[PDB]
Amino acid sequence: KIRIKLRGFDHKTLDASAQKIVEAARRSGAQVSGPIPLPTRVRRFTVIRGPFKHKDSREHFELRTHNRLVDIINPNRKTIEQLMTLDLPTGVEIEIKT
């Protein structure tokens, strides 16, 4: 009945962090839902390469955010207290829901 929402730019570190979250939570007794991949959100920026003119240059950039979900069921006192303690990587952002 607790939801773990993970966001980040780099998917390697996000996947890694989700792995530790789910593993540690599993070791503390009750059932784990499992890492749920949610659809990524992509922003596109199209900018003229040239600084003055040549409007047909058009370099493309993308900024993509990834999403995860963990959804721990039957929260133990140990499960919760051991959680909200593990330090996040440099990128990964976490949200706790009921």
Partner: protein
């Protein structure tokens, strides 16, 4: 011509972002702006030290600045006075209690920014450009470095007309992704204008 930036080409693979933090649309711009301020301050301050790279990280209203320097002795000094006052200055810039770290680069001949900086210094010291480039390329190649290349922009030795000098040695495959090419640019401000020194170092594969 018009080659693209060899780093921006390989950001996903074989290179890593200098800045590693996440922020929503709400606070992205503010964090980036303060990041730019930090980078500018550290560029201005730690020039003589032999700076190569600045890394920024964020966890929770926390900043972990990491500075790559050829000579950390210059950075720290006696009893870590300079590093302490520098931490104080950075924290005064942004109320987030930044945690400054200093790393020494192994064999500073294998850092493209450093090579470009040194050659730019030599140009500003009115050295002969061609000899300087040749010596720099040879120096890099002696320290492993399966390939090296150095370019100087133009306006050589106060001559009226500008011209590119250019010198390479070994393999510099700019087209292959798994190349691990280190890139460094330095601007040399001289009495007769400005010169642009570029350095590519092909350091292994994959």
């Amino acid at each position: 011509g018009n080659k693209i930036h060899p780093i921006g080409f390989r950001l996903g693979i074989t290179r890593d972002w200098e800045s590693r933090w996440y922020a929503g649309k709400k606070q992205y711009r503010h964090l980036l702006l303060e990041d730019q301020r930090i980078r500018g301050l550290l560029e201005k301050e730690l020039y003589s030290a032999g700076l190569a790279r600045v890394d920024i990280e964020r966890a929770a209203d926390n900043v972990a600045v990491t500075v790559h320097v050829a000579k950390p002795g210059v950075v720290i000094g006696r009893g870590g006075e300079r590093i302490r006052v520098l931490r104080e200055e950075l924290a005064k810039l942004t109320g987030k209690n930044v945690a400054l770290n200093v790393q020494e680069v192994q064999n500073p001949n294998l850092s493209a920014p450093l090579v470009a900086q040194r050659v730019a210094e030599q140009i500003e010291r009115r050295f002969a450009v061609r000899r300087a480039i040749k010596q720099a390329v040879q120096r890099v190649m002696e320290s492993g470095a399966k390939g090296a290349k150095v370019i100087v922009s133009g306006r050589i030795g106060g001559a009226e007309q500008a011209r590119t000098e250019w010198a390479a040695q070994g393999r510099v495959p700019l087209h292959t992704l798994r190349a691990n090419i280190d890139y460094g640019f330095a601007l040399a401000r001289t009495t007769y204008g400005v010169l642009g020194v570029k350095a590519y170092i092909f350091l292994g594969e994959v």
